[PDB]
């Protein structure tokens, strides 16, 4: 549905890349953090929910699901926190392929940026703009349709 997002955490260069995927479109937002904490995850979700109409988040692991700080952010922002258990198993493989794909793009841009965070944002750009309609186009269409 239009409001469903999935959290995803992947590792690169001794750092963590936290990713939110809009499940119906494939659109992503991402940030680099030193390590996955409840505090970082809570702040990331607050940013996300101020930018898109986030109704439901499938959390990436049990620690973030349990985190009182993540729960506080979800309460504040009106997000239903759910487990991310892939009862449909093609869900997990799609996330796995996306992490591989994002890492490939990061490799392709890596030498154009001094800092990993910049390379990650370049990769977000390329991912969201790539036509296959683009993910950026798909999310806007899905949400506009839901509004009207």
Ligand X SMILES: O=C(O)c1c(C[C@@H]2C(=O)Nc3ccccc32)ccc2c1OCO2
CA atoms of 74 and 130, how far apart (whole Å): 31
CA atoms of 103 and 11, how far apart (whole Å): 9
Selected from 63, 76, 85, 93, the binder of a copy of itself by CB under 8 A is 76
- With CB cut-offs between 5 and 8 Å by kind, which of a copy of itself, ligand X, none does residue 82 bind? none
CA atoms of 116 and 15, how far apart (whole Å): 9
Residue 113 engages ligand X in binding (rule: CB under 6 A): yes
Selected from 15, 43, 61, 103, the binder of a copy of itself by CB under 8 A is 43
- With CB cut-offs between 5 and 8 Å by kind, which of a copy of itself, ligand X, none does residue 125 bind? a copy of itself
Show contacts with ligand X in window 6-65 (CB under 6 A): 39, 42-43, 46
Residue 124 engages a copy of itself in binding (rule: CB under 8 A): yes
- With CB cut-offs between 5 and 8 Å by kind, which of ligand X, a copy of itself, none does residue 12 bind? none
SS (H, E, C) 48-73: HHHHCCCCEEECCCHHHHHCHHHHHH
Query: Residues, the chain, total?
Result: 148
């Amino acid at each position: 549905s239009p409001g469903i997002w999935q959290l995803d955490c992947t590792h690169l260069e001794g750092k963590v890349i936290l990713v939110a995927v809009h499940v119906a479109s494939g659109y992503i937002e991402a940030e680099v953090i030193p390590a996955e904490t409840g505090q970082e995850t809570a702040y990331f979700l607050l940013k996300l929910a101020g930018r898109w109409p986030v109704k439901t988040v499938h959390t990436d692991n049990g620690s973030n699901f349990t985190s009182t700080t993540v729960k506080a952010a979800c309460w504040w922002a009106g997000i239903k926190q759910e487990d991310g258990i892939p009862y449909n198993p093609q869900s997990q493989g799609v996330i796995e392929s996306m992490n591989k794909e994002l890492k490939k793009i990061i490799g392709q841009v890596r030498d154009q940026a001094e800092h990993l965070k910049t390379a990650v944002q370049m990769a977000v750009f390329i991912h969201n703009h790539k036509r296959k309609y683009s993910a950026g186009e798909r999310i806007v269409d899905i949400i506009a349709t839901d509004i009207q």
